[PDB]
Amino acid sequence: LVASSGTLEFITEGFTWTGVTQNGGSNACKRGPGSGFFSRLNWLTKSGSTYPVLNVTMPNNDNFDKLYIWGVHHPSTNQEQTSLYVQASGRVTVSTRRSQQTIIPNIGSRPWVRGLSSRISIYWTIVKPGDVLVINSNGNLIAPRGYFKMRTGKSSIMRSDAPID
Amino acid sequence: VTMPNNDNFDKLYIWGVHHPSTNQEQTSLYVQASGRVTVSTRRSQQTIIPNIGSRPWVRGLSSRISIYWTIVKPGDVLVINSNGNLIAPRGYFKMRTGKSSIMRSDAPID
Amino acid sequence: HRILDGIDCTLIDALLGDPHCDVFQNETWDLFVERSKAFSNCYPYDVPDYASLRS
C-alpha cells in the first residue's frame, strides 16, 4: 500500500488521549544515551492505577485518503499485562463507517528476539474522505501519532542488494 | 436447532452476529453479558465471537451487525447453537447453477 | 437477458430484508444492476469479505 504511493508524509494530527500515560518504551530499544520507543506510534500504558475507556474521533474533511497505523500489544505472560495495564483482559476495536475490525490480544510466550520475549501485531485501517475514525479499546492499544497520504502513482517495491550509481 | 437437508439442491442460510455499542446494550437485549455464535455443519465449522465496541453514527444508530454465511450440502444437517448475539434465519435460497453475474451500472433500462 | 433494476437496494439489501426492496419478493433475474445512488435506510450492517457473499 505505501510502496504503491511512495511517500512518508507523516502529518501529526491533534490526537486527544486523556487519562493515559503516553510515550511508553523499553530498555532494549534505545535512542541515544537513554531509552527510546517508536517515533511513528505511541505506546499507551496505564496512568497510575486507573485505565479508563478511551474514545477518540478522527474526522476526514480533506480530499485525500488517510492511512492509520495501530498496533495490538502481546505480553509474554499475565504479569506483564497487569504491570502495564489495569484491566487483565483488553480488547482493541478500530472501526469506520464502512468497515469494522476487532483484534483480540493474545497472551502467550514468544521466542527470544533481540533480548525480549514479547511482540506486537500490526493491523491497518484506511479512512475514506467523509468517514470518521473511532478507536475505542480497553487494553493493549497502541495509538497512532499521524497518518499518510494515499497517493496514486506508478510506484512499487523491489528487494535488491546492488549498489546505487 | 437442527436443519436436515433431504432435498436435491444446495441450501444457503444467512445468519448475523449482533455487535452492541457498549455493555449497556448487551445486558438490555441479552441476559448473558458475553455471547458466542457457533454455526457448524458435518463438513465445516465457523465460530464468530461478538465484539463489543463503539461505532460511528450511521443512520442515527451507533451499532452494526456482522454477516457470515453457511452453505449446507444435500445430506448435511445445520446445527446453530449460540448463547447470545444470535440472529436467526427465516429461510434459505436455492443455489442454482447458471451463467448469471452482477454488474454495477448507472445507465437506464430501455 | 432478464435485467433487474436495483434502484433503491443493492444485492445485499435484498438478501437481508431491507424495507425498501419489498417488491423483490421471490424475484428471479439474470443480471443485477446496482446503482451508484443506492443507500441503506435501516439498521446498519457490515459484511466481512464483501466480494465473497455477493458472488
Swiss-Prot record, chain A:
Q: Which residues are glycosylated?
A: 55
Classify the source by domain of life. Answer: Viruses
What name does UniProt use for this protein? Hemagglutinin HA1 chain
* The organism's taxonomic lineage, starting at the top: Viruses, Riboviria, Orthornavirae, Negarnaviricota, Polyploviricotina
Q: Which gene produces this protein?
A: HA
Q: Which residues of the full protein are shown?
A: 127 to 291 of 566
